[PDB]
Amino acid sequence: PTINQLVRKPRQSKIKKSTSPALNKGLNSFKRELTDVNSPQKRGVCTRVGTMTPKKPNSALRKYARVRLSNGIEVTAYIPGIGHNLQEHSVVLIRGGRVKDLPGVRYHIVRGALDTAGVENRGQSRSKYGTKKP
Amino acid sequence: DGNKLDLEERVVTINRVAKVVKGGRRFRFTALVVVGDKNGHVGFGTGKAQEVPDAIRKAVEDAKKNMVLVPTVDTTIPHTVVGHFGGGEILLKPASAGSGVTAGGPVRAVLELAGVADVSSKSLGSNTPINMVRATIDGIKQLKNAEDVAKLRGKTVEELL
Amino acid sequence: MTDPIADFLTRIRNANMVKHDKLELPASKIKKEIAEILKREGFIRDVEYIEDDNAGTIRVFLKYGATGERVITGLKRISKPGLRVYAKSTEVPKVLNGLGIAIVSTSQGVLTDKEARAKQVGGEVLAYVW
RNA sequence: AUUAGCUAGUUGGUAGGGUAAUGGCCUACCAAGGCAACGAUGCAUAGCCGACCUGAGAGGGUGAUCGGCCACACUGGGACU
RNA sequence: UAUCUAACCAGAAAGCCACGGCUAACUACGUGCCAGCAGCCGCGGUAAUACGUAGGUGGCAAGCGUUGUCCGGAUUUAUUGGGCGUAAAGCGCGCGCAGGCGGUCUUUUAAGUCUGAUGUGAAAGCCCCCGGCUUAACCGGGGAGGGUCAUUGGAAACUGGAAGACUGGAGUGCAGAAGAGGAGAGUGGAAUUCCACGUGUAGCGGUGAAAUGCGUAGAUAUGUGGAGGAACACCAGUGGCGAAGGCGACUCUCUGGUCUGUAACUGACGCUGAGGCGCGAAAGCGUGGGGAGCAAACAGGAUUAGAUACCCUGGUAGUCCACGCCGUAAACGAUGAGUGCUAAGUGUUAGGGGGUUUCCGCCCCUUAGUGCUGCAGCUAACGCAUUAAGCACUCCGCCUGGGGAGUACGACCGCAAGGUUGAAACUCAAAGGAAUUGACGGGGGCCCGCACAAGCGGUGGAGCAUGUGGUUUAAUUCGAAGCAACG
Ligand SMILES: [K+]
Ligand SMILES: [K+]
Ligand SMILES: [K+]
Ligand SMILES: [Mg+2]
Ligand SMILES: [Mg+2]
Ligand SMILES: [Mg+2]
Ligand SMILES: [Mg+2]
Ligand SMILES: [Mg+2]
Ligand SMILES: [Mg+2]
Ligand SMILES: [Mg+2]
Ligand SMILES: [Mg+2]
Ligand SMILES: [Mg+2]
Structure with missing residues (x-):
């Protein structure tokens, strides 16, 4: 462009989207108005639990839970690891992370933080999946 | 110039590449x-x-015939320059002594094996x-003493000083 | 139009390309200054000025080394109408760490970067020469 | 600018009173200006800086702790000392 | 409390992540597109270094890893530092207010620029030099840096302001030349259709075949005469003009612009041009005419598995005009306007100049166009190449991954159809351009083979033998499965 063009309008960079929009919103009951606050993790209440058929190429059933977070946003969270404790009205803690197999999931459930009891029988990567040392 | 020296060749990329026929690939x-040679x-x-080594040796045989010199002034190139071959756009700036060469593999190799x-x-x-690499040599063709x-x-x- | 000096530098480039021996262009004071300066620096075989009905004309005889080697690799303008460049004695940079040269027009007349340093002046960076 | 008109003590002046003090600070009278595509007006956002993190540098983001300044003490207004 | 002395004890003090590539570090079992893994690419369907576990290894280590956020890498908003022929990107084109930018010279200034001095930009923090804590972190001392900082004093090269002067830009004049440039009015004959009348007898039309349809109430054709409208062969040509859309029969009127030559005249009067104003193919909309042909829609007949289509026969809107709206386009050279510079060859158009010659005719030089081929140079390539996609400068418009989406909200316009401006959520890991190798082709060309065709004799029909399938079986062993399994 010409310099006069660049002065009449300077540049404008790209509008960045977050991987994790719902972690980046807080709530106050008083105002009843969402408040932008960068957050790593949120807790919620499992509305629904179920299985998913993932994309091509894959075919295994994937465990998800539809959660209502603390801030009121309804979110689908993958339940990683072998087996789980969860059911309806179960409280859950939620971190970000995208299940590439599965279309509508963008977040994971931290395993071992709350009523998400740790995985059974696991020995390796225990800090993930939330088993104590035996 | 020529195939008349002891040298220090280095392989940069080896790309398997496919011609395709009725009988496949x-x-x-x-x-x-x-x-x-790091003397310049x-x-x-x-x-x-x-085959890998056959390609390597043919490459060596073309290299020893398509060589050039680069000036090595005070452990540095004499001045700043840019090469522009095709989609190659590579600038070279000198630097302070003892800093070391600072470049990616396929250009690092050029400058090291020259000895800069x-x-x-x-x-x-x-x-x-x-x-x-075409960009590198287009650049260090422009360099001057x-x-x-x-x-x-x-x-x-x-x-001039 | 809007640029005599750019026309001058570009005609010199375009004659470097074809390796013409001479190149004639309408003249002005600044053009004559920069021709003088290139003759001082060692880029021009010779320059001579000519009278005409309009404005006077200038002719540059170009300088090549042996084997038809070029001595001018490139010219360039920096301070332009749409954007000018005004630099100090400290902000004029050494073209190619001193292999090439620049032109800075200052209070002491039109000069090079090195002369402008010697006189501790500054002004319009009119041009670089690789 | 998926906000272009805004202002009416608003702009200037002559008198007057008022403040620790200049001034439409306020009052009366006169004229109808003044600002604004160099973005006024309006909406949303935000305490500002020294500085902090990053970056070859230009620049990008932030304004925890430390220091300076500003503002506010449940919300609003008002004075006394 | 630190600190210091002795005594006693290896004794009580190591875990986290990963090991397919990107990236350091491989084996075994178990599982079997299940369970599960995953930052990107991607693993797992019975032999998994990619899942789980064990061993071993790598990286770190009192921390390791994941998540969230910020910079960089990302030249992915490019001032430094990008681009728009085909990839995203040139408004469809113009007229032009504002702004940006501006030919050559002299004087004047000092708005911008440059420069010496003074003052300040706190301490802490970054940086450098010393010192102190068992070093380190940390802490102290000193210095430095940092401002489009301000005042004051100087220079006039450039930009800017001012007063003059000049002409290569720009324009007027003067002498010529071309032209489907536009609007209006009128006008011509081909030629389709229709009306009448003769001659005139059984078909015509159309298709891959047909049929629907017209025709003895007389066609089809053939001649004569008349009516009506629409478009204008030859000329006519990568030829002309126009800003573009676009403009082809002729004449007249009213008009615009272009080029050539001169150096007469003014003397930078200019280039672009946001926001505005207008024009703007075809379709379409309102009112009123006209309506011959062609023809969306529609009807009938075929086709087809079906055919809401190609195909045939008919046929309304429309197409045409006046006026006014609509303002879109593969509106395209998919290439913004302007200026200058940088090899050639050759057509073609409109001009001028000169040499020769009886004009004619040939030749060369030059101006503005229009086309072909090509050097440098550019380009990812294809290709562009004095009609640049080259080298440079000014100005405007526009792009920033695909889709959603040119959608939604909002505003403006519009009688309406709808147009202009123009997002996000969400989703993907690609989308795409050019070119290469093949393969294919209801594309072409050339050549061959019992491949066809030409012929001979056969199979499929009958009975039996054999093999295979399906089935029924205690079992009817297993394998082979288009050509290339099935005596
Ligand atoms: K007031
Ligand atoms: K109509
Ligand atoms: K067209
Ligand atoms: Mg606030
Ligand atoms: Mg950077
Ligand atoms: Mg296994
Ligand atoms: Mg495109
Ligand atoms: Mg300080
Ligand atoms: Mg129409
Ligand atoms: Mg036969
Ligand atoms: Mg038989
Ligand atoms: Mg069998």
């Missing part, structure tokens, strides 16, 4: 290889063969090593 390998000379070559010890660089354009430039103009080195 007839894979071959390409080898781009940089030859030099460098050159790149390419070769093709169904202290240079900065940055790939601006494409990342394809063939065009990167102070004595040569004085001989052109009619000046003295202390007068």
Whole structure:
């Protein structure tokens, strides 16, 4: 462009989207108005639990839970690891992370933080999946 | 110049590459290889063969025939320069002594095997090593010595200085 | 139009390309200054000025080394109408760490970067020469 | 600018009173200006800086702790000392 | 409390992540597109270094890893530092207010620029030099840096302001030349259809075949005469003009612009041009005419598995005009306007100049166009190449991954159809351009083979033998499965 063009309008960079929009919103009951606050993790209440058929190429059933977070946003969270404790009205803690197999999931459930009891029988990567040392 | 020296070749990329027929694919390998002597000379070559070493040696054989010189002034190139071959856009800036060469593999190889010890660089354009190396040599073709430039103009080195 | 000096530098480039021996262009004071300066620096075989009905004309005889080697690799303008460049004695940079040269027009007349350093002046960076 | 008109003590002046003090600070009278595509007006956002993190540098983001300044003490207004 | 002295004890003090590539570090079992893994690419369907576990290894280590956020890498908003022929990107084109930018010279200034001095930009923090804590972190001392900082004093090269002067830009004049440039009015004959009248007898039309349809109430054709409208062969040509859309029969009127030559005249009067104003193919909309042909829709007949289509026969809107709206386009040279510079060859158009010659005719030089091929140079390539996609400068418009989406909200316009401006959520890991190798082709070309065709004799029909399938079986062993399994 010409310099006069660049002065009449300077540049404008790209509008960045977050991987994790719902972690980046807080709530106050008083105002009843969402408040932008960068957050790593949120807790919620499992509305629904179920299985998913993932994309091509894959075919295994994937465990998800539809959660209502603390801030009121309804979110689908993958339940990683072998087996789980969860059911309806179960409280859950939620971190970000995208299940590439599965279309509508963008977040994971931290395993071992709350009523998400740790995985059974696991020995390796225990800090993930939330088993104590035996 | 020529195949008349002891040299220090280095292989940059070896790309398996496929011609295709009614009977499917007839894979071959390409080898781009940089030859030099750290007392100052460098050159790149390419070769093709169904085998890794065959391609390597053809590349060496083209390299030893398509070489050039680069000035090594005070462990640095004499001045800043840019090469522009195709999608290759690669600038070379000198740097302070003892800093070391600062570059990616396919350009680092060129400058090291010439023996230039202290240079900065940055790939601006494409990342394809063939065009990167064509860019490097297009650049270090542009480089000039102070004595040569004085001989052109009619000046003295202390007068350019 | 809007640029005599750029026309001058570009005609010199375009004659470097074809390796013409001479190149004639309408003249002005600044053009004559920069021709003088290139003759001082060692880029021009010779320059001579000519009278005409309009404005006077200038002719540059170009300088090549042996084997038809070029002595001018490149010219360039920096301070332009749409954007000018004004630099100090400290902000004029050494073209190619001193292999090439620049032109800075200052209070002490039109000069090079090195002369402008010697006189500790500054002003319009009119041009670089690789 | 998916906000272009805004202002009416608003702009200037002559008198007057008022403040620790100049001034439409306020009052009366006269004229009808003044600002604004160099973005006024309006909406949303935000305490500002030294500085902090990053970066070759230009620049990008932040304004925890430390220091300076500003503002506010449940919300609003008002004075006394 | 630190600190210091002795005594006693290896004794009580190591865990986290990963090991397919990107990236350091591989084996065994178990599982079997299940369970599960995953930052990107991607693993797992019975032999998994990619899942789980064990061993071993790598990286770190009193921390390791994941998540969230910020910079960089990302030249992916490019001042430094990008681009728009085909990839995203040139408003469809113009007229032009504002702004940006501006030919050559002299004087004047000092708005911008440059420069010496003074003052300040706190301490802490970054940086450098010393010192102190068992070093380190940390802490102290000193210095430095940092401002489009301000005042004051100087220079006039450039930009800017001012007063003059000049002409290569720009324009007027003067002498010529071309032209489907536009609007209006009128006008011509081909030629389709229709009306009448003769001659005139059984078909015509159309298709891959047909049929629907017209025709003895007389066609089809053939001649004569008349009515009506629409478009204008030859000329006519990568030829002309126009800003573009676009403009082809002729004449007249009213008009615009272009080029050539001169150096007469003014003397930078100019280039672009946001926001505005207008024009703007075809379709379409309102009112009123006209309506011959062609023809969306529609009807009938075929086709087809079906055919809401190609195909046939008919046929309304429309197409045409006046006026006014609509303002879109593969509106395209998919290439913004302007200026200058940088090899050639050759057509073609409109001009001028000169040499020769009886004009004619040939030749060369030059101006503005229009086309072909090509050097440098550019380009990812294809290709562009004095009609640049080259080298440079001014100005405007526009792009920033695909889709959603040119959608939604909002505003403006519009009678309406709808147009202009123009997002996000969400989703993907690509989308795409050019070119290469093949393969294919209800594309072409050339050549061959019992491949066809030409012929001979056969199979499929009958009975039996054999093999295979399906089935029924205690079992009817297993394998082979288009050509290339099935005596
Ligand atoms: K007031
Ligand atoms: K109509
Ligand atoms: K067209
Ligand atoms: Mg606030
Ligand atoms: Mg950077
Ligand atoms: Mg296994
Ligand atoms: Mg495009
Ligand atoms: Mg300080
Ligand atoms: Mg129409
Ligand atoms: Mg036969
Ligand atoms: Mg039989
Ligand atoms: Mg069998």
